[PDB]
Ligand binder design. Structure first.
Ligand code: CLA
Ligand code: CLA
Ligand code: CLA
Ligand code: CLA
Ligand code: CLA
Ligand code: CLA
Ligand code: CLA
Ligand SMILES: CC(=CC=C/C(C)=C/C=C/C=C(C)/C=C/C=C(C)/C=C/C1=C(C)CCCC1(C)C)/C=C/C1=C(C)CCCC1(C)C
Ligand SMILES: CC(=CC=C/C(C)=C/C=C/C=C(C)/C=C/C=C(C)/C=C/C1=C(C)CCCC1(C)C)/C=C/C1=C(C)CCCC1(C)C
Ligand SMILES: CC(=CC=C/C(C)=C/C=C/C=C(C)\C=C\C=C(C)\C=C\C1=C(C)CCCC1(C)C)/C=C/C1=C(C)CCCC1(C)C
Ligand SMILES: CC1=C(C/C=C(\C)CCC[C@H](C)CCC[C@@H](C)CCCC(C)C)C(=O)c2ccccc2C1=O
Ligand SMILES: OC[C@H]1O[C@](CO)(O[C@H]2O[C@H](CO)[C@@H](O)[C@H](O)[C@H]2O)[C@@H](O)[C@@H]1O
Lengths: 162, 176, 84, 56, 730
């Protein structure tokens, strides 16, 4: 049958809750701070023709990790985002195993969310010691923050505050 | 919510597909088979050595006289006889329909069990790779573009140009 | 900063001039026309005390109170008050 | 193939390296070098105020 | 309808004769219903007796206009791009004479394609892109080629919002049937946030990128594709980066400035398109309002309020049903939208807003008559649709005893006056001219009405024009010249190719056209006014809202009983307005060229396209084909074998099509029947006709194929007559 797409007060919000969750670790720059020593800046159009920003950052933007094959990625691995969205509609058989061979008890996990198959290795608490939209809410309070920090300048002048 | 589209003659398009791409089967491996340098080089001075050419557009007649006979006398009597006039059995004729072809005629029939059936087993072969030809010569018939377009230097037409790294052609593989 | 810092506080001289003169002028509304200088509820004079307009429209002059001479024709005389 | 090996200087160390081609050091210490000069120093320490904005 | 309500098929209705009122298109065959179907296709007395949907259609089948205006414009930006002449013309204006369109040399074609400027074969333009396009804080041909697809972007999307309505299971009532906010929004931030946003991209980028164009260069010897960011360093030439100010207010010092704006008025010597140093300030000074303004408000309250003695008790309550009409809240609009378009048509020619207009004569009068026929074709409409109200829209009569029920109360009255108004005019407003002929052909000038014989004396001046160009000495601040250079007082020096605007003098031969307009504007309106007013009931027919606002004519009785209705008042009211506009046009160019347009050289001895021939000689209404029609038009009937030629070569057709209207306008109906059978007979003998009962035209269709033709005839006639006497000398 024809594919589906139910709107209803607030799908737009479940997938809109989700969009920012992904963008909260695609926040990247300060979540994984080792990520950019200077990688937040993409480094457009700085040909051995010419130039970057403008007075920039300048003591390209950069050395680089370049290239092409940028569309093929975001498309091809977007050709997976909509599969853990179909496959586990369910009727399970994913573990096609191998025709012969009884020696395949070996499992791996199950369906995972978190420390894996299950949680696991029961046995725990000594020390580590002394609601999950908050695990969302605070990372747009990390997202939209670099947002203005791209253009984060007064330039002609600077910190009035100071 | 969905198109009222399925042609009813949606049945025909598919045995029109057994045409286009089983036929295009005889293209993928004869072309990309080539033989690079078998020993090496083709030398074709034969029926074209010295008799003022051979074919080109006298090629078309000699090619498509018996291809005219072949393709022409194909869908016409794939099966359907009876063929007359008045009322509908729905595709846009089916004047054969309930009648197989001839009441008490001759050997209109191929094989036993009052049908044209060549038995039930043979779904194995011609379902996958043979209609794969459909979905293969889809993007591997759309390798057409990659193989030539970009017009190996000689020709740029209405010069906009607009970009320049390096050329594009065919041989297999790729930079990167 | 700059003189614009003593002007950062001058955001107050308009915005607080505006919004502090705000509520009263819309407070006992549902009124439209009318007041005391017309149709029935007389206690005359001009009077005395009733806010927004009076105080803050007088504060535009006020901002020019202590910064006066200051800037103006810069510093003169030997202590205008006589006290040491 | 300046920098098949962006090899350059000293090792080490004292100062303004960046030779000598390259140059200079332009504003040096933590700056530039960043590059990445290195290191971090009981400085200086950039942050504001100073450099004594030595201009002029 | 029928197949197959309701729950039970997807399966769409393709096949089974008819739909549209109920002994419908009947099984039994006919033709009339094929003009039916297209006509009245949009309408509402059928589709459903229930509002609901309709507003759910009109908010969609609306949409596909924007999207269209959007597929359009694209083929115009593309067109005004790679079919170039814009690059060529801009480094080289005063000089060029622009193109966008070009043939392909099939058959006769090519004659139409005739050297236009930056070195190429094509057909010209009187549609002032190449001049909005001055704008381009950037320049580049492939660039417009982005603005272009930027166009097709808005479209497909601003056209899948129309899928994303009606066809998608729709909003409802409240959504529009709560109106409470609508203009709140609209005027505040778009009306505002455009004009606003337009400010930001009207000094940022444009001002500077023609601040130093008005001199020379060849583009990209100027205005990069990014260049205009943070770099507030070239914004250095065209005022401060605020230097020491912070977000206007006052503790600011000017010992020498006052931000961009520094208000102009007049006209650039080198590009008299009016100054831009202003154009930001005025759009800024707009938006604010809208920005403040669109902040009413929530509705009755304000109209439920001020009444009086004779005034409008129903003023109070002036329509619950103004959230429940359309046909009403469309007709109102058209009068404004429409009447608010031809107010353009002036402020344009006596105040150009684009670089290179006036000098460009033909590329802003086309304008001033195109814009001019909408500020009229949209007004008769703005009446029609009120008639459409006045007849039907509401369910019952819930609306009562008010401003209207009032106006109607008098009605053989408001239109009783207005009438005499017109015959007072007409006699003072046309036979006025006819005097002249009868007495100048009699010939005794002593006694004409000349700008000089009947007492008026070498001055017009002392009125209000002369207190306009001279007002920069009131509460007025100032700024050299006026507001509109065409005013009485001071100044001359305007432009170095040809001319632009200068005073524009008056008296008589300006006095009386100005009056024919009155009488023409008035008797137009009489017929629409009385038309829409007497919409539903009367003492020629009271049983007279009983079908719709059309209906042919009630019937041979009562004497006449034919025209009546109000489709038809909106049929003979077009008939006039075609004049209303068609003679206002006739006015402007005969002025604007008899005086104004003309030309400088040494000692700027002015040399109008015509040494004011107007003078003593429009006053004669023959002079109007001595000096006009037979004078100019000699360019239409010389125009063969050329490049424009498509005008002379139209000017015969369309000067034919009109003279085909009369046949549709002037004739019976069971006539072409009585004829259509003789035909139908000869048809049957060979066995070749009956199926789909061939039928003559639907009494009022017939009038539909008058009128519409009479206009697309009688009009493009001049659309040709014009472009052929501004291209080529003028
Ligand atoms: C050229 C560019 C460069 C850039 C700019 C990007 C950019 C992007 N890539 Mg990517 N990629 C690159 C090179 C690049 N890639 C290369 C060279 C490869 C080959 C490996 C990939 C392989 C790759 C894959 C497989 C995917 C991406 C995805 C993405 C997108 C994911 C966004 C994200 O923040 O996920 C990471 C941010 C998070 C908050 C997720 C946290 C999850 C972590 C902990 C798992 C990995 C960390 C791990 C423990 C490290 C162990 C080592 C292990 C790699 C062997 C993003 C737009 C993803 C995507 O966008 O799919 C639709 C995914 O598809 N890339
Ligand atoms: C905001 C405005 C606008 C809108 C949305 C409407 C909407 C409507 N009008 Mg309306 N109208 C308008 C402005 C508008 N009008 C104006 C300005 C006028 C004054 C002329 C009118 C005069 C008018 C009348 C008299 C009628 C309507 C009617 C209607 C309704 C019928 C619609 C229909 O079937 O299309 C009609 C369009 C056609 C059938 C297409 C034929 C167009 C021909 C004449 C071509 C025009 C010439 C052109 C040059 C030809 C193309 C070029 C060619 C040479 C290649 C509909 C609700 C009708 C009704 O009965 O109400 C329910 C009634 O007929 N209108
Ligand atoms: C159809 C297009 C038109 C064109 C041709 C461009 C072209 C460009 N825009 Mg752009 N833009 C447009 C319309 C256009 N824009 C519109 C309508 C808007 C919205 C108003 C913008 C808003 C915009 C912004 C905000 C930016 C650009 C930037 C850019 C530049 C970065 C491209 C680049 O270097 O890629 C190739 C990438 C490279 C890294 C170069 C490779 C060079 C090597 C191989 C040598 C590029 C010159 C960016 C810029 O100026 O600098 C970063 C900037 O981000 N544009
Ligand atoms: C600017 C003009 C314009 C616009 C935006 C519309 C819009 C519309 N017309 Mg319409 N119409 C127009 C001019 C226009 N018309 C003219 C000049 C005529 C001649 C009389 C008609 C005669 C007409 C009829 C008879 C009908 C419509 C209908 C419609 C609506 C149906 C949409 C649809 O079903 O699928 C959209 C389908 C496509 C985009 C497929 C591609 C088809 C080609 C043409 C592109 C839509 C609101 C239908 C209606 O009543 O809806 C309100 C109705 O059947 N129109
Ligand atoms: C506003 C109007 C509309 C109109 C009246 C035209 C009219 C024209 N276009 Mg056009 N066009 C438009 C929108 C329009 N276009 C849009 C939106 C696009 C973008 C898709 C184009 C892209 C386009 C191209 C590429 C061409 C035309 C060409 C033409 C001319 C060829 C005639 C033809 O189309 O059939 C026959 C004709 C003058 C052709 C031309 O200019 O050569 C003479 C050229 O083929 N157009
Ligand atoms: C609706 C508006 C439009 C838009 C989208 C912008 C947007 C911008 N303007 Mg701007 N501007 C506008 C109208 C607009 N302007 C008008 C009408 C004027 C004069 C009346 C200016 C005078 C102006 C100046 C002097 C500057 C800007 C700057 C900027 C940029 C950053 C600062 C800022 O204004 O907002 C974002 C808010 C903050 C960063 C705080 C940003 C690209 C500055 C710039 O180049 O980048 C920093 C600065 O140079 N503008
Ligand atoms: C019909 C009734 C009622 C009556 C009897 C009047 C009577 C009058 N109104 Mg009036 N008015 C009314 C209701 C009424 N109004 C309502 C309901 C409104 C609001 C809709 C107004 C809004 C209004 C305005 C703005 C004006 C009047 C003016 C006038 C006066 C005309 C000036 C004159 O003749 O002296 C002049 C005699 C000389 C000898 C000189 C006249 C006394 C005019 C006025 O104030 O006097 C000029 C003024 O134009 N009225
Ligand atoms: C300049 C260059 C380059 C390159 C390279 C390249 C470079 C290539 C390209 C390719 C391309 C492709 C593959 C595609 C593309 C597309 C695009 C880029 C687009 C974009 C866009 C924009 C911009 C916006 C809108 C959207 C779009 C998408 C349209 C070069 C340079 C140089 C020098 C210095 C010297 C010599 C050497 C070299 C090294 C050479
Ligand atoms: C979304 C937007 C916007 C905008 C802006 C806009 C939204 C603008 C607009 C404007 C508009 C305009 C500007 C209009 C125009 C029009 C036209 C141009 C037309 C014309 C014409 C005429 C005259 C008539 C008819 C014909 C034609 C069409 C031609 C934004 C938003 C936002 C948000 C939320 C976030 C933050 C940022 C912001 C920004 C705050
Ligand atoms: C004879 C003819 C034609 C004529 C024609 C004529 C003799 C005329 C016509 C005309 C048309 C028209 C005319 C249309 C149109 C149009 C247009 C496009 C317009 C536009 C415009 C506008 C926009 C608005 C207003 C203004 C104007 C008009 C400009 C033809 C004939 C024929 C034959 C033999 C047979 C076959 C068919 C044919 C081939 C067909
Ligand atoms: C001339 C005239 C006619 C006769 C006009 C007619 C019959 C015009 C209709 C002719 C149609 C449009 C011809 C349609 C035939 C073609 C569409 C069929 C072939 C299809 C094409 C391929 C040619 C009237 O019917 C009429 C009615 C009311 C008032 C005045 C008049 C009036 O003046
Ligand atoms: O093995 C990965 C590769 O990337 C590393 C991780 O190993 O880290 C940076 O370097 C790559 C280039 O290889 C960057 O694209 C990557 O995204 C960076 O984090 C580097 O050490 C390795 O070369």
């Amino acid at each position: 049958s024809d594919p589906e797409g139910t709107g209803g007060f607030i799908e737009p919000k479940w997938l809109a809750y989700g969009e920012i969750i992904n963008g909260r670790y695609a926040m990247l720059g300060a979540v994984g701070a080792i990520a950019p020593e200077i990688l937040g800046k993409a480094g457009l159009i700085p040909q051995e023709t010419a130039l970057p920003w403008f007075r920039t950052g300048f003591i390209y933007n950069y050395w680089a990790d370049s290239y092409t094959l940028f569309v093929f990625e975001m498309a091809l691995m977007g050709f997976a985002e909509h599969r853990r969205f179909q496959d586990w509609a369910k009727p399970g058989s994913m573990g096609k195993q191998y025709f012969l061979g009884l020696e395949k008890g070996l499992g791996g996990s199950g369906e995972p969310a978190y420390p894996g198959g299950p949680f696991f290795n029961p046995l725990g608490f000594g020390k580590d010691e002394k609601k999950l939209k908050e695990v969302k809410n605070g990372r747009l309070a990390m997202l939209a923050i670099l947002g203005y920090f791209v253009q984060a300048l007064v330039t002609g002048v600077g910190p009035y505050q100071n | 919510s969905d198109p009222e589209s399925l042609r009813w003659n949606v049945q025909a398009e598919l045995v029109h597909s057994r045409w286009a791409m089983l036929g295009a089967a005889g293209i993928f491996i004869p072309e990309f088979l080539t033989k690079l340098g078998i020993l090496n080089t083709p030398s074709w001075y034969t029926a074209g050595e010295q008799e003022y050419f051979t074919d080109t557009t006298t090629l078309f007649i000699v090619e498509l006289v018996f291809i005219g006979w072949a393709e022409g006398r194909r869908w016409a009597d794939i099966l359907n006889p009876g063929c007359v006039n008045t009322d509908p059995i729905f595709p846009n004729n089916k004047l054969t329909g309930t009648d197989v072809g001839y009441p008490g005629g001759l050997w209109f029939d191929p094989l036993g069990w009052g049908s044209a059936s060549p038995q039930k087993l043979k779904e194995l072969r011609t379902k996958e790779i043979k209609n794969g030809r459909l979905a293969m010569l889809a993007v591997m018939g759309a390798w057409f573009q990659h193989i030539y377009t970009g017009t190996g230097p000689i020709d740029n037409l209405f010069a906009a140009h607009l970009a320049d790294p390096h050329a594009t052609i065919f041989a297999a593989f790729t930079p990167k | 900063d700059y003189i614009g810092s003593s002007t950062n506080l001058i955001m107050v001289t308009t915005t607080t001039l505006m919004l502090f003169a705000g509520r009263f002028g819309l407070a006992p509304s549902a009124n439209r026309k009318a007041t005391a200088g017309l149709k029935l509820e007389a206690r005359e004079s001009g009077i005395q005390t009733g806010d927004p307009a009076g105080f803050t429209l007088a504060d535009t002059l006020a901002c020019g109170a202590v910064g006066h001479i200051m800037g103006v024709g810069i510093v003169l005389g030997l202590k205008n008050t006589g006290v040491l | 193939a300046r920098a098949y090996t962006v090899e350059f200087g000293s090792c080490k160390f004292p100062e303004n390296f960046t030779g000598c081609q390259d140059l200079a050091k332009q504003k040096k210490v933590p700056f530039l070098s960043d590059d990445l000069d290195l290191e971090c120093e009981g400085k200086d320490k950039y942050k504001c105020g100073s450099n004594v904005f030595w201009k002029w | 309808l029928v197949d197959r309500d309701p729950i039970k098929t997807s399966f769409e209705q393709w096949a089974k004769p008819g739909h549209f009122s109920r002994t419908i298109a009947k099984g039994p065959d006919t033709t009339t219903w094929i003009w039916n179907l297209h006509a009245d296709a949009h309408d509402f007395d059928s589709h459903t007796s229930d509002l609901e949907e309709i507003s759910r259609k009109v908010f969609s089948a609306h949409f596909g206009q924007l999207s269209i205006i959007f597929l359009w414009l694209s083929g115009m930006y593309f067109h005004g791009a790679r079919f170039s002449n814009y690059e060529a013309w801009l480094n080289d204006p005063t000089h060029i004479g622009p193109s966008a369109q070009v043939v392909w040399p099939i058959v006769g074609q090519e004659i139409l394609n005739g050297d236009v400027g930056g070195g190429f074969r094509g057909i010209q333009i009187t549609s002032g892109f190449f001049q909005i396009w001055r704008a381009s804080g950037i320049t580049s041909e492939l660039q417009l080629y982005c603005t272009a697809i930027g166009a097709l972007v808005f479209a497909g999307l601003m056209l899948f919002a129309g899928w994303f309505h009606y066809h998608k299971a729709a909003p409802k009532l409240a959504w529009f049937q709560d109106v409470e906010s609508m203009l709140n929004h609209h005027l505040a931030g778009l009306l505002g946030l455009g004009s606003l946003s337009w400010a930001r991209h009207q000094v940022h980028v444009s001002l500077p990128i023609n601040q130093f164009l008005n001199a020379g260069v060849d583009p990209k010897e100027i205005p990069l594709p990014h260049e205009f960011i943070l770099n507030r360093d070239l914004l250095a030439q065209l005022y401060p980066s605020f230097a020491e100010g912070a977000t206007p207010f006052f503790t600011l010092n000017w010992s020498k400035y006052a931000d961009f704006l520094t208000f102009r008025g007049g006209l650039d010597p080198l590009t008299g398109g009016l100054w831009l140093t202003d154009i930001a300030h005025h759009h800024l000074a707009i938006a604010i309002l809208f920005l403040i303004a669109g902040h009413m408000y929530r509705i009755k309250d304000i109209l439920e309020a001020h009444k009086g003695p004779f005034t409008g008790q129903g003023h109070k309550g002036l329509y619950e049903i103004l959230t429940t009409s359309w046909h009403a809240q469309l007709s109102i609009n058209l009068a404004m939208l429409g009447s608010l378009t031809i107010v353009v048509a002036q402020h344009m020619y006596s105040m150009p807003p684009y670089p290179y207009l006036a000098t460009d004569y033909a590329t802003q009068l086309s304008l001033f008559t195109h814009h001019m026929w909408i500020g009229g074709f949209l007004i008769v409409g703005a009446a029609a649709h009120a008639a459409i109200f006045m007849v039907r829209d509401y369910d019952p009569t819930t609306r009562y005893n008010d401003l209207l029920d009032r106006v109607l109360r008098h009605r053989d009255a408001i239109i009783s006056h207005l009438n005499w108004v017109c015959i007072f005019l007409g006699f003072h407003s046309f036979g006025l001219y006819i005097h002249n002929d009868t007495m100048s052909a009699l010939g005794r000038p002593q006694d004409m009405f000349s700008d000089t014989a009947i007492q008026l004396q070498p001055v017009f001046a002392q009125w209000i024009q002369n207190t306009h160009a001279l007002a920069p000495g009131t509460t007025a601040p100032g700024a050299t010249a006026s507001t509109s250079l065409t005013w009485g007082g001071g100044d001359l020096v305007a432009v170095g190719n040809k001319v632009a605007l200068l005073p524009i003098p008056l008296g008589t031969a300006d006095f009386l056209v100005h009056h024919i307009h009155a009488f023409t504007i008035h008797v137009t309106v009489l017929i629409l006014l009385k038309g829409v007013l007497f919409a539903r009931s009367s003492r020629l027919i009271p049983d007279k809202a009983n079908l719709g606002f059309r209906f042919p004519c009630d019937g041979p009785g009562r004497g006449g009983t034919c025209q009546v209705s109000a489709w038809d008042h909106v049929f003979l009211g077009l008939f006039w307005m075609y004049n209303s506009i068609s003679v206002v046009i006739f006015h402007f160019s005969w002025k604007m060229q008899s005086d104004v347009w003309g030309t400088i050289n040494d000692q700027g001895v002015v040399t109008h396209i015509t040494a004011g021939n107007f003078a003593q000689s429009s006053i004669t209404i023959n002079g109007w084909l001595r000096d006009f029609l037979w004078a100019q038009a000699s360019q239409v009937i010389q125009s063969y074998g050329s490049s424009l030629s498509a005008y002379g070569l139209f000017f015969l057709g369309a000067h034919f099509v009109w003279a085909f209207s009369l046949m549709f306008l002037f004739s019976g109906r069971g006539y072409w029947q009585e004829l259509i059978e003789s035909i139908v007979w000869a048809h049957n003998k060979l066995k070749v006709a009956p199926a789909t009962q061939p039928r003559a035209l639907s009494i009022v269709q017939g009038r539909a194929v008058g009128v519409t033709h009479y206009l697309l005839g009688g009009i493009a006639t001049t659309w040709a007559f014009f472009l052929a006497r501004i291209i080529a000398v003028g």
